[PDB]
Structure 1
Amino acid sequence: AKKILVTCASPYANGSIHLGHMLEHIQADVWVRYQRMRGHEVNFICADDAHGTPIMLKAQQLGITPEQMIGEMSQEHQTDFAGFNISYDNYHSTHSEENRQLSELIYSRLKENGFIKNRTISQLYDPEKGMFLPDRFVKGTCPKCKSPDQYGDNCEVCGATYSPTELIEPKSVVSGATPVMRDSEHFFFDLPSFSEMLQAWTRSGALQEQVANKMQEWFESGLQQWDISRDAPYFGFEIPNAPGKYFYVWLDAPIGLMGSFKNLCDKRGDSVSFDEYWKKDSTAELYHFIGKDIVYFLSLFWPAMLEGSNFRKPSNLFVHGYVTVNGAKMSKSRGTFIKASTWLNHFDADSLRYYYTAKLSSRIDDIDLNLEDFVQRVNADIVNKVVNLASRNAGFINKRFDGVLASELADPQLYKTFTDAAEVIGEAWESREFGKAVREIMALADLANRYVDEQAPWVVAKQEGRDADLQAICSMGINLFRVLMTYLKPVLPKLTERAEAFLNTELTWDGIQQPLLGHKVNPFKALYNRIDMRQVEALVEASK
């Protein structure tokens, strides 16, 4: 009965989707699919973050328009996400008419309300190319150790940190020309004006404890005005009444999520939902799934921007940690920097979805993809615990009972134990305690396989006159499978479809209350195959 708008952070246009992105999008998709299973109105929204100096320069180097480049990158991203069955209701772009109009609108309102300030700043400028240079586009000699060709505000040889203005014999990364300091008028958003409001939100208890603690650190350091303008040349939205000035990509980026929803409503011919979800008096819920590196933008700048422009603010922020492979940050040299597209050439989407889900919690701690454990866990849990319940029992039903399940449950008590667990498992999905949900589900799977072993169908099947017993035992196992697959439906989309085809029924959350009796099931190839380390080794080699 709830109206929920859920978003995932917008992937940067100039970068292929990797395992890190997948952790975020999979976490959100699992939650979204569960919400849909409970009958709520859900709108899963995302978009490609396509503006900025890096993108502008990349396009120039490739000899194509930025529009063409971001378009191709967007399609690549969507192909990968579709491959992992991320169920977005809309995937738009921050470079859109919807975002242009909403960004101009919000800026206008913020300015009218007195939250925009003008101040001149001094910044390194490339006089040859004719453009201001972001820190990483300035290279030179470290002022401390004198090591050459160091980029931005830090030296990769001695570890020193400094302003790029301290680099010796500075050079433009773009043209090689010597940059010089140049003045420029910039527009600033008065974030400090929203300090009390933001502090109240931080202590409200809605945000994750770890996030609230980090925010207190930021309040202690002190909030500062935010530089939201960038000079031409730039690829983005030009600021109204300010020729040659553009909105910094980070200002328009989150607005792009609002833009993606407007685009969805407009395509649907829905003239009421946008305001119903974004107006101050909205009763709809708004959630953002994000990573630790952008919490400052989404927890401070964003809510303040919305408040200052008369829009509702996030109901909550769901933050996840970094992804590690084999315990460490992804390493290109070790072949652990894995792209989503590469992953799919070696394994299916469900395997990664399951593994991440089994490790995820409501905290922001890092998630580790240990490849050896990946093979062991997928084979042990999916193939040997869950799918086993169907694969060990379906054959007998199809070959000896014409594919028809027993007329009654052989062990009603055991079945109730399984259906009684729906409350706790659903609450775990709801609270984002994915690890807890999976542990509860696998505990049930253990009891199910214990039941089959206690009945020993491989023994019953060879004994004279025990046909009824065999059908009863195998049908019972298949019904336990039905329940487990329902609980795992948000996690394993493809296996679920194969399971529903086998069971001749769509799996619904409430449906488990009525077991399948005197019901016809269909035969199947292999619901899920084992994986091995040879495949992992191939994945790693292909990623080097």
Structure 2
Amino acid sequence: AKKILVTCALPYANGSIHLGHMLEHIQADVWVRYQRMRGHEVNFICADDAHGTPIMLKAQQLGITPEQMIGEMSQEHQTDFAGFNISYDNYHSTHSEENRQLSELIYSRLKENGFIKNRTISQLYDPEKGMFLPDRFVKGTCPKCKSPDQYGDNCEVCGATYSPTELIEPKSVVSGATPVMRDSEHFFFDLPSFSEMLQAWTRSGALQEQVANKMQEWFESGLQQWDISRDAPYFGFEIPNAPGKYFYVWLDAPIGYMGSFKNLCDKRGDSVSFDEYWKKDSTAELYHFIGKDIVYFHSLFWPAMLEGSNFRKPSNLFVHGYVTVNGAKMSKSRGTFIKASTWLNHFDADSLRYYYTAKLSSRIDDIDLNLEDFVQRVNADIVNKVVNLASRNAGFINKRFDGVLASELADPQLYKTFTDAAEVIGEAWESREFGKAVREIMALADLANRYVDEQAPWVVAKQEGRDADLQAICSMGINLFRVLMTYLKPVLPKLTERAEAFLNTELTWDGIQQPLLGHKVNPFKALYNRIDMRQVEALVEASKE
């Protein structure tokens, strides 16, 4: 029994969960459910990333404490994830006592080990509001084309890039006052010291090929010290012995993974598991599912931080690409920037879980949600191939045989073909080659339906004295359905529950080796209905508004 700790990136507390987030949490949940099916001790961990200037300011605008705002967003996020049946063992927050103590601990260890440097820097400062301004909170006139109202380090008119200090007639986005350059002492983590350690980690062959390639680019560019401090006013953790200084959000965010697990352990009254999973000599496995935009933090800063603070490092990073809708980046104007909550008003969770899973692989390529294809694939695969196997046979069993399945498999060889595929399918789930697993499963589905077509139960049903053969044929189809639903259990939690209720049995990975013989099944109303483009149109229109 392996001990596995799996995480998804911590969603920022200043935005609603959208389809992009869902790709990641669904990918991880499918993997996690599969690992649980194989009997491993699994801990699926996540939490809201709740610190930062953006969050501080938004709360101030809304007129509420940052605590109240993040609390509300945390509830919103968890309701959405719950709606998609993401099976977390714990969903915490970076703004917690566990994270505060772990962040202070790791910082102190890094400092004690000589990995923290003090350095003075100059940054735009709002004298009115009395706060340093991150680039995005500085607006002015583009130095090049002279277009007004430009934000940050780039112009949205001529496309020029530059330091905010180059902006003409700068203005604070917060107060409108003119910002001025001001000095301030900052604390830096000496990432460069871990260069060789990180390079070895990169070439070990554990990380995805594409990720390793990206890392080589970063080593080539040269690692730099990392500014991990921010001045007050700020919403975050105060730095020990440094009044008015806070830990930059990205320093405490990943520590949030640890904080969330410590929280879970403490709530369980478990006093040994935290160290068993995080101590340097851990035999437990640690995996982070993340998007390509945050690979730098997880592959360079993070492993280094852990190493320097005497904690074990990630066993592996599982990176995925971006989500596109109809081939392009989500677009608000086109109504393709879809929120998780909105999606659930139109379709069930299983439909999206299946679609993403059918397109996912072990690579970091973008995943495209083509809405036209979505309708076609769900109806073709879920309704017509898998669920069909149950719906086309259950009726005869319930009405003609009192719900009792035959005492023997009509086609043992065919059944063995299905159970024999468990090894390859499980390996595909294990290796994250989801698309491959789905292709294999649907190939079996076609084989199952061909079997039923060949036996023509609709013909046998109307022929005198063929009762025995009818029960045999239909039971066979139902047993093939049993196996298919087992392979799909990690993917379709809800349909699986309905399938288990119909079958009167919990679906376990090894259970497929024992077909259901002389077994009572229950009647069932629509296990899964078809969807149509009208629903897709409604979703897009609702998203536009």
| TM-score class normalised by the smaller sequence | over 0.9
Deviations 1:414-441 (A, max 9, x none): 0000000000000000000000000000
Q: Classify the secondary structure of the residue corresponding to 2:47.
A: strand
Matched with 1:162 is: 162
Measured after TM superposition, the shift of residue 515 of structure 1 is 0.1
Matched with 2:305 is: 305
Measured after TM superposition, the shift of residue 272 of structure 1 is 0.1
Rounded to whole Å, the distance in 2 between the matches of 1:153 and 1:15 is: 23
Deviations 1:475-501 (A, max 9, x none): 000000000000000000000000000
Rounded to whole Å, the distance in 2 between the matches of 1:338 and 1:27 is: 18
Deviations 1:297-319 (A, max 9, x none): 00000000000000000000000
Measured after TM superposition, the shift of residue 38 of structure 1 is 0.1
Measured after TM superposition, the shift of residue 410 of structure 1 is 0.1
For the pair 1:330 / 2:336, whether they are aligned, the reply is: no
Query: What are the ranges of 5 or more consecutive residues in structure 2 without an aligned counterpart?
Result: none
Deviations 1:297-349 (A, max 9, x none): 00000000000000000000000000000000000000000000000000000
Q: Classify the secondary structure of the residue corresponding to 1:392.
A: helix
Q: What is the 5 A alignment of 1:443-458? A: 443-458=443-458
Deviations 1:436-489 (A, max 9, x none): 000000000000000000000000000000000000000000000000000000
Deviations 1:340-383 (A, max 9, x none): 00000000000000000000000000000000000000000000
Deviations 1:376-402 (A, max 9, x none): 000000000000000000000000000
Rounded to whole Å, the distance in 1 between the matches of 2:495 and 2:362 is: 25
Deviations 1:11-67 (A, max 9, x none): 000000000000000000000000000000000000000000000000000111000
Deviations 1:202-249 (A, max 9, x none): 000000000000000000000000000000000000000000000000
Measured after TM superposition, the shift of residue 170 of structure 1 is 0.3
Aligned residues: 544
Measured after TM superposition, the shift of residue 166 of structure 1 is 0.4
Rounded to whole Å, the distance in 1 between the matches of 2:417 and 2:309 is: 51
Rounded to whole Å, the distance in 2 between the matches of 1:162 and 1:320 is: 31
Deviations 1:87-123 (A, max 9, x none): 0000000000000000000000000000000000000
Q: Classify the secondary structure of the residue corresponding to 1:181.
A: strand
Q: Classify the secondary structure of the residue corresponding to 2:311.
A: coil
Q: Classify the secondary structure of the residue corresponding to 2:104.
A: helix
Deviations 1:246-274 (A, max 9, x none): 00000000001100000000000000000
Measured after TM superposition, the shift of residue 69 of structure 1 is 0.3
Rounded to whole Å, the distance in 1 between the matches of 2:315 and 2:54 is: 33
Measured after TM superposition, the shift of residue 127 of structure 1 is 0.1
Rounded to whole Å, the distance in 2 between the matches of 1:26 and 1:147 is: 43
Rounded to whole Å, the distance in 2 between the matches of 1:347 and 1:477 is: 28
Query: What are the ranges of 5 or more consecutive residues in structure 1 without an aligned counterpart?
Result: none
Matched with 1:429 is: 429
Rounded to whole Å, the distance in 2 between the matches of 1:337 and 1:445 is: 33
Rounded to whole Å, the distance in 2 between the matches of 1:515 and 1:262 is: 42
Rounded to whole Å, the distance in 1 between the matches of 2:307 and 2:59 is: 35
Deviations 1:177-209 (A, max 9, x none): 000000000000000000000000000000000
Rounded to whole Å, the distance in 2 between the matches of 1:147 and 1:359 is: 43
Matched with 2:172 is: 172
Task: Report the TM-score when normalising by structure 1.
Answer: 1.00
Measured after TM superposition, the shift of residue 275 of structure 1 is 0.1
For the pair 1:13 / 2:13, whether they are aligned, the reply is: yes
Rounded to whole Å, the distance in 1 between the matches of 2:25 and 2:91 is: 12
Rounded to whole Å, the distance in 2 between the matches of 1:477 and 1:524 is: 16
Q: What is the 5 A alignment of 1:80-99? A: 80-99=80-99
Rounded to whole Å, the distance in 2 between the matches of 1:264 and 1:19 is: 27
Measured after TM superposition, the shift of residue 281 of structure 1 is 0.2
Task: Report the TM-score when normalising by structure 2.
Answer: 1.00
Q: Classify the secondary structure of the residue corresponding to 2:385.
A: helix
Measured after TM superposition, the shift of residue 132 of structure 1 is 0.1
Moved over 2 A (4+): none
Matched with 1:532 is: 532
Rounded to whole Å, the distance in 1 between the matches of 2:192 and 2:449 is: 59
Rounded to whole Å, the distance in 1 between the matches of 2:302 and 2:466 is: 67
For the pair 1:280 / 2:288, whether they are aligned, the reply is: no
Measured after TM superposition, the shift of residue 78 of structure 1 is 0.1
Deviations 1:134-168 (A, max 9, x none): 00000000000000000000000000000000000
Deviations 1:263-302 (A, max 9, x none): 0000000000000000000000000000000000000000
Q: CA RMSD in A?
A: 0.2
Seq. identity, %: 99
Rounded to whole Å, the distance in 1 between the matches of 2:229 and 2:464 is: 83
Rounded to whole Å, the distance in 2 between the matches of 1:359 and 1:158 is: 37
Q: Classify the secondary structure of the residue corresponding to 2:246.
A: strand
Q: Classify the secondary structure of the residue corresponding to 2:328.
A: coil
